Amino acid sequence: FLPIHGVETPNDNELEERFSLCLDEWGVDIFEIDRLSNGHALTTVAYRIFQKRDLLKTFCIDPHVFVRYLLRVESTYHADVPYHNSMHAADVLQTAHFLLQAEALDDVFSDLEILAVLFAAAIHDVDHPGVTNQFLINTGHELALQYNDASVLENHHLYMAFKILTEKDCDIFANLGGKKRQTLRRMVIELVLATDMSKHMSLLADLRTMVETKKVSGSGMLNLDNYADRIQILQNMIHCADLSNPAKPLRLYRKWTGRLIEEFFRQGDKERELSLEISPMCDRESVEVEKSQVSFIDFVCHPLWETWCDLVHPCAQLILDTLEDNRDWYECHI
Template identity: 65%
Template sequence: MDEWHINGPQDLVTVPQCIQNAINKKPLCSSITYACTGNHSPTPCHTHLFQFTSLSLCIPDLGNGCACRRSPLGGVCVSPRATLSDQQYQQLALDTLEELDWCLDQLETIQTHRSVSEMASNKFKRMLNRELSHLSEMSRSGNQVSEYISSTFLDKHNEVEIPSPTLKDKPMSHIIGVRKLSHSSSLSSASMPRFGVNTDYEEELAKELEDLDKWSFNIFRVAEFSNNRPLSCIMYAIFQERELLKTFRIPADTFVTYVMTLEDHYHGNVAYHNSLHAADVTQSTHVLLSTPALDAVFTDLEILAALFAAAIHDVDHPGVSNQFLINTNSELALMYNDESVLENHHLAVGFKLLHQENCDIFQNLTKRQRQSLRKLVIDMVLATDMSKHMTLLADLKTMVETKKVTSSGVLLLDHYTERIQVLKNMVHCADLSNPTKPLPLYRQWTERIMEEFFRQGDKERERGMEISAMCDKHTASVEKSQVGFIDYIVHPLWETWADLVHPDAQELLDTLEENREWYLNTMPQSPSPPPDRHLQQDRFQFELTLENLEHNNHNHICLKSGRSSRSNQKAICDDNLKIKNKKKDKHPIKTPNVDAIVTLSPEMCQTVPQPLSNVASKQCVQGRGWGSHHEAMKLWDQGQQV
């Protein structure tokens, strides 16, 4: 096994020698196989170029003198292009595409999918770090936004100072947060309310539920008319519409008992992560499951698992972040070893509640069905950990680009890894769907999340802790945080999802653009404070990846106030979230990835860096994503505080 690189030494992957020869454009047989026999022709191979998750692979055309094993076409030998008729050449193209499909199947078989996704994830992280480093220089609030995005959506393992004294020893054999409640005594199938909840506003509620299948659904009105039982009402309505109670023989009274018990374990005094948010994510997941591109793709069990995962994904949320729980040495952090603390807890509570009286909604599933459902739900809820965002996005982007090349663009999810990948991203998209909703709804969600952030900041201030990014009510910029949130996180995710289900999500992207523009236009237009040397030293330091080293060492790497820059190098970008060097090295050096925090004095920086906003391609202005924060950058460059 040898190593080869794509678009530079930073993108390394292990592949068979045969594939390496293909990438190096050596004369080879018509397909990428494990074994080739015969005399290779000295005639250079024609090549086809296809895009694969922002990485370019060169696949050789059919050459002379080869006999291939395990290829669909066997050992077909074809003359060079000059001796082929148009009909022969067209047939050659079709045969090559067929072999390309076969080739990708082999790559999946030898489990290179993870390597490709990891390369994409690492590349996305480098691009995002570069953008955030530039944003952090613009103003104090810009630095806060950058730090928040980096600390929340990038999976980093920072050193944590555990405060003392530690908590007293407590028995941890039980799942904390689970309370014994009883709703079953007053429920029966004969007396079941129309929408699963008792309310004096049944007609008004019925009117709102007519829009259950719409993305513009107003969950706030449902909460108002359902006696503040939005999750119970939404779950009952969706399960009735999809006939899941009938399909899985779930008794109606058992179902309502469980969802009411589940809803009671969401904290009403938490501003954002409460049962209203759970109901919103559940309804959004319901709509995404109904998108035409995914019609008849998922089984009833997978649909059941996705809706259940959405309903429990934040149960018993305390209103603080994972990092806060870790920093305060909380019992939950100790129980789950600092790994996806809240997500693990939500799962434990959600499944534990099934054991309460008349709450086992899965009692009539077979053992195999229960095991499959549990695995699906665990995978989906753990994927709601925002620190896993870049990995999810890279996996989804890899799938989208692969499907563009194979199967005539038809979405085929044949394996569990592919199906769960889409389901995880679906729930993740639903969890990050607020900016894609109509502006009045989006603004309410923004007010709620900022209130929750500020409450955490107050707790940190009272404890003498460092206040987390975007949690200081005295310095946080709500408008700027939303613009940055959309540009760096939400739009890249939803744009990739829209590619997967094209053209079904275009309306959502349009709404996202409109909401982004609204927040951009409401930013306070005040001059930025002058640079302060002391503040510059306190700025958040971003990870810098050393990449694309050249023989002549023309690239000077400089990090000042968390910013990376390169001389004699311009970047271009496109709407597929790719940033490439205009000038490619003919003989790039094979160098492993080096991730480090690089701190250099100003004297060591031998060149004046160019902001990415100054060299970003104009085509990015119409879209969002890394390298396309152009309008906001222009305002900053003009000395305005955005």
């Protein structure tokens, strides 16, 4: 008695068509999936990916339960936050689903590790209030005091996703063994913590380490039986996915960017209003959109994707190309 896409929609055959051809593609139109499904990108994309990877069958997750949990997660994203809402989460979830398909990663990950990274992706920004970690620290907000300045929002997103599992008939993980639930919980934690930006430099250093260890190996592929290595990859992977907008098709990159800048400007408006110094990129009086994108691509996004593409060489070529064309496009619109 379950609609073909988990929750009901006005546009079932269109959506079937989009999901059937697009979900293993780089560069999916999450905004249209959202409009076509009446606000339910997250729930629909997640339902379909978990069906497509056989994850309901594999972990005995009741599909009514999955759907209800996601509907609640989706509701606890804030629709009025311009960028960090459930469409962002649907994007990151699909993108991570894509980056798992690279031929150089076939049979490296257990199914529980796949489950972890995709669940993490779906929840990684749940309840975001549209302000950065630095803002919450700089303002002495309750959350920053509580988490002692460390991964403030990421910790909070995790808290909210786990409380929701409690609620009546929402525990998708109910039929997993005890030592699995606890293993999964450990991974999901580590994965959503890896989306905190202040870990960027550290993760990228571990990822290059592992690139260098693959270039010098006798059999040009990596010993990935150590769980500690695997989880590093997966930490980088969900962070790549979170920083994927500048490597998406130009039109989608620009839509994502207009939203991000509106979020940032609103935060600068709150800073101005409290006599605080205005965060980078948050100042509507002073900021220069194009120059900020070129500099973010040069200093953060390109060196991350370059190293990722080097690990999975050559299965992520299109990413790096689209990223570079986007860089150049933004440079000559300065």
